[PDB]
Write a protein that binds this ligand. Sequence first.
Ligand SMILES: Nc1nc2c(ncn2[C@@H]2O[C@H](COP(=O)(O)OP(=O)(O)OP(=O)(O)O)[C@@H](O)[C@H]2O)c(=O)[nH]1
Ligand SMILES: [K+]
Ligand SMILES: [Mg+2]
Ligand SMILES: [Mg+2]
Ligand SMILES: [Mg+2]
Ligand SMILES: [Zn+2]
Lengths: 299, 99, 131, 230, 244, 136, 289
Amino acid sequence: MQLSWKDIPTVAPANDLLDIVLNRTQRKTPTVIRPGFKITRIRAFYMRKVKYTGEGFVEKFEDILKGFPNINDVHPFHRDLMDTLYEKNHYKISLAAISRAKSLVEQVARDYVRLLKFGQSLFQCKQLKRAALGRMATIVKKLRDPLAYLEQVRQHIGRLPSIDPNTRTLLICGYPNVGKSSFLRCITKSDVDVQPYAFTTKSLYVGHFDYKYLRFQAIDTPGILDRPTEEMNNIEMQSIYAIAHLRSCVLYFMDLSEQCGFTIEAQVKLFHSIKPLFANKSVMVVINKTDIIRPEDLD
Amino acid sequence: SQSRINNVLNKIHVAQPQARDDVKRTPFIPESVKNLKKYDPEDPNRRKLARDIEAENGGAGVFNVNLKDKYLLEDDEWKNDIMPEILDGKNVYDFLDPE
Amino acid sequence: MGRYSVKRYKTKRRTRDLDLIYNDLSTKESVQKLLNQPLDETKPGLGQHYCIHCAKYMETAIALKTHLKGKVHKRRVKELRGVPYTQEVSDAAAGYNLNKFLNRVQEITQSVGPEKESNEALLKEHLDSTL
Amino acid sequence: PQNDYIERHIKQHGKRLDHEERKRKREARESHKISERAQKLTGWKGKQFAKKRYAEKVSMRKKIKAHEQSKVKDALPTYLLDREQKFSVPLPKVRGISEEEMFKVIKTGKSRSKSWKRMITKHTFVGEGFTRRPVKMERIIRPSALRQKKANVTHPELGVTVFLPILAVKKNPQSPMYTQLGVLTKGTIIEVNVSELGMVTAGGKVVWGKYAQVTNEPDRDGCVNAVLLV
Amino acid sequence: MATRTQFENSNEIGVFSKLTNTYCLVAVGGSENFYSAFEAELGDAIPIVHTTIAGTRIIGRMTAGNRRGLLVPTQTTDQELQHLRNSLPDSVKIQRVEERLSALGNVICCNDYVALVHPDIDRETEELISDVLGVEVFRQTISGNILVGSYCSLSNQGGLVHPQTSVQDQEELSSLLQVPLVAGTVNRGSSVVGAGMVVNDYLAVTGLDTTAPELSVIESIFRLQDAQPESISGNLRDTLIETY
Amino acid sequence: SGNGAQGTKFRISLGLPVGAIMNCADNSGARNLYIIAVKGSGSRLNRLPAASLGDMVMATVKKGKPELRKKVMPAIVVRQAKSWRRRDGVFLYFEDNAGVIANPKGEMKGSAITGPVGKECADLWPRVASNSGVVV
Amino acid sequence: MGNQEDKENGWTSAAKEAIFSKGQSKRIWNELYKVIDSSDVVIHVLDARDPLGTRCKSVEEYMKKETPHKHLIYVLNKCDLVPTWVAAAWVKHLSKERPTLAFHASITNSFGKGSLIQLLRQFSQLHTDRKQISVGFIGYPNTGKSSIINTLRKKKVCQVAPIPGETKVWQYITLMKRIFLIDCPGIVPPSSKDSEEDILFRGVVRVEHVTHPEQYIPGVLKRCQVKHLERTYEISGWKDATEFIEILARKQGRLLKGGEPDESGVSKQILNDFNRGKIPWFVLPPEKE
RNA sequence: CUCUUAAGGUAGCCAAUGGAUUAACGAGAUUCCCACUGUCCCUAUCUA
Ligand SMILES: Nc1nc2c(ncn2[C@@H]2O[C@H](COP(=O)(O)OP(=O)(O)OP(=O)(O)O)[C@@H](O)[C@H]2O)c(=O)[nH]1
Ligand SMILES: [K+]
Ligand SMILES: [Mg+2]
Ligand SMILES: [Mg+2]
Ligand SMILES: [Mg+2]
Ligand SMILES: [Zn+2]
């Protein structure tokens, strides 16, 4: 596996990419050609312009395409998490648009070099070169929305924590405001926030510790509500996918003081509703906030 | 799983000796070693290490340590003595000998 | 300096030393190993037909026999007679480790010498019988 | 670090102590910086700066006009709304092209002494079932890179452009020799396949072939553009 | 009593140092951080000597010895030999050995009582080992691996062999050496344990890259801490199964 | 001065330019190594990259195992026949040119080295010194 | 267990040899498109030993897509090097797709010459309004296009060699007043599944420019029969390629100075014999249905 | 009016051989290998 995708080069928008590639052609290729020179020299000049611009566009597209992960090829946990975060359909459509643009730019470059083989004057060769560069620019301008989407996705996916779905995992789940982030702070050195309102945590947080010289990872999840999956939202789907995919030891945290805003009956109902999730996994129920109320003096 | 059996056994097995002679072999810990005190990096009264001496004198790559300071000689005045090596085409070391 | 000596005694064209050959001939086990060699495809005669004195492979037993009936082989055999001349001899000549040199000389005279001679005689009769 | 750690760090420790003042002074300096850039940048960078400034001013004026206009205040069927998209030719006269411009002399022989072969430098339509003449009897050369099969045809009615296959060359305005050679130049009348345009006669016949006029120079811009003669 | 350090960002402690029960040898290269790392654990209880062997820094690989003696190769200079003699007390015999295999730390793996040697060392070298080190000598290969000094770490308590050693070879070597043996790695997966670490009856020094399970195995087999026997392999079995 | 080398390296006379063939001194099955490049080599017009004792090269195996051949692997030069000066005061040389196969971190593929190993190479590379039986 | 494990030790595969890309140059493919554009009938020449190996499927698809008016036929050459039933089975199987004619090309002792001539006369009669037709010969290198043209002319008008790539440009030959033949350089369509071993055993490259032919010798052992090899080289008793090479070199006296046998030279000679038809071999035809 | 895919299991029938895939020879044209080396890295020195 890879477990981290921070090493993706910056994706420029359409106009910025156009400026970068065209100005690179202007700077890095010679720019003086005279009408008094040989027609072979003139043809070579404009052929070099077309070929160099095409290569620049293609290498930018290839850097985009190689860096981004294959959503289908990754582990199913990562696939479900990235589908929840980024809408896999849009993800694949944008990357496919990049690939199609790369093929079209290559085709334009080949066609116009072949046409420039037969140029008879500087004016005609200049017109053919400008036509090739303009067609490439139109292709690139047709990618404005996918490039912006991919830049946002790259920035977000560079910050995702590295979760190994095959190592030893303590998963933490329950209702909001029960102390999952506080327990993660107590057992690891993660910087998860602890605030007394619902859904303080909107994404998975990872901590680490060592038990008997063995490395364990602890996964704090955003809270789950007792609602059917049709009206379940993406933030809760993060926790649902984590529970379904990570074979681990699950710790369901209960608050008996109802400081969380959910009753003990509601917590038990949520536990029995998410009961089918932890099959063939270790399960444990932890009652937090015992300094306020104890399980012994309950009804 | 039947695959990981021999590999696990060959590294979890601890070999043991057996007799072979009436010879007693015991571990040796010197008295100074077992009376030594544990070093405390954050302590007001601890031993000044050689790196502390180097840092206070010159620092790494500037401090020139004297190796002759650790010599266990009969006389301490002999520590900074230059040992001759050549005399009239002969090596002193292959003539050096008691009696 | 001259071309003949340069292109004969280049370092990459060096031959085995006389003291090494003497050590090979001194012990019976070494002689047996050199007589019974594994089949090597990179050697002349598949590693067989090896003259130990000259440290040289022959393509055939008839070639080995002709080599044995020659003055070059006799020259090497005569060279392999006396003290092997290690560094201790030059040190003793300079006046260094004289007692070590004397002990080595008397060991060669007493124990190593006659055993090497008997091994050479057995090798000679073995080669004469088999060839 | 994981998730939005920079924002969490800003929430937990704040920013640098002079961040707001530094940002405010830089934004105050921006006007002087813009004027100095306009008067100091030279060459291509200066021209690009002027072009971008013009575009920004146009956009700002449009925004002001739209805001003021907002502050002041085809008979399609139901299933089609909420959805989007003289017998004179348009080019009676075009530039004359001489044979010297049309043809290029191709020399043969070891010493290049024979000059009887000619190469057409313009784009051509050779048709179906074309085979090259044997090289010994090949005087007129139409290279394969310059042969065309399709054109971008604009329909005057309905305002669309479709990529259509070429059927024939009807009249090249320069010469009947160019017409029979199939030369595609500006003002050439070609025949195009209009099957995907969905044209039906008054008698119920499906139209799949009509005339169009080439309105560009394919030798210059590498493609054939035409207007359908409806 | 297992510590982790580096000699100038290198994990090969046994290459650049030699540790016995009565003295320690460290290379002179660079600053005094390596010397002070040994000094933090050793105090002034046993001598610690900066030294070079034939001008090189590889003293753990060039030299071999135990609490009673030290053997240096013939490439040692007279000045270095005199430096060692002046730095060490008279209770440690020092001998320069005329041996063809000059990497004594590679060809000899010894403790205070037993020694395993390269099967092609000289008989005079064997007798010199017996006389100077005061030990019994056995010609062995560690599961066919020559260079026992580089492929074994040995003390009077226990021993660590390279991870490709068969069970029968471990049994035979344990019978010969009269100490418990274990197979494992050091410095995060290295099979050159003898050049990876140095050890005595009361201290082990490995590289910084040695993992926690490897350190636990080393502590258990060398009986370093007060509550570390060789029988806690059963208690570490879960961690070792997960780690392997 | 290469990745995995311990410390700086002082200049040694260059003996092996690109195209040279040296013996293989390890036990990995290779018989000889053919030098195709020298790590850390300089840039100069017409000048061939050349290796010396203790240098890391890229080598192909000409003679050896068929599975071992037809690939490029890092190697470390441990013997050279070109004389070089030791700072202690002598020029010295070996009979042959010889190297060992290693990885980019400087770790040996084999388990032992046959024949003498130069002091410069052994002191530069800790794994060579660990696998060496004879050091000069 | 393949590519990923090699990079960990720093091992990189050697650079691909430039000899194995012969038949893929832009010059050669420009010549091919020239002869196809000039041809009314295209003859694809196949080697009867490996006819599916020597098929240019991409060129055939291009012809059926872009130039459907040109007539493409198959000539299975070198039928003398295969058993009669093998050639008959290959003719039957290839006739399900295209008209296929068995052939043995030779100026003096040929087979199929009259059948090919009457077929070309039929094509001329079908194009009686064209005043002439051209027949372009295409196929893999060293399949025998020049030999077939010389057979039809009954005269050495096209240069012929056992080495691949003898023909380098196109050439017009007048067979009759209305029939022209066009000789063309050999082509190798690019592909990723076709390895250097397959390229070498299709007779594409000259063996003198390959690096280590000993690694390709096991391909010879797999493709040939043991009895045929031992009858050709008068040896026996080998168990693998290295011992086969060693026995052959020692029998032939191909020893280098110092005693090591000339493995590369013997291997190059074996590959030359295999490709040139001194060792009998063929690929099995498809099973009858 | 009709024509072509019948042939079958690593060597056939049919008339020693089934051939120009021709030995030998060549200041003819060309590719490769061993050996060899100042062709080269990289130039230095000696004589008339
Ligand atoms: N046995 C046999 N050999 C043939 C036959 N036809 C050609 N050959 C041989 O095969 C080799 C290839 O001959 P070419 O005529 O040059 O083949 P090509 O396809 O023209 O090859 P290139 O011109 O190099 O692309 C020659 O040595 C011929 O003698 C055949 O029908 N039977
Ligand atoms: K040919
Ligand atoms: Mg929370
Ligand atoms: Mg140059
Ligand atoms: Mg040809
Ligand atoms: Zn002899």
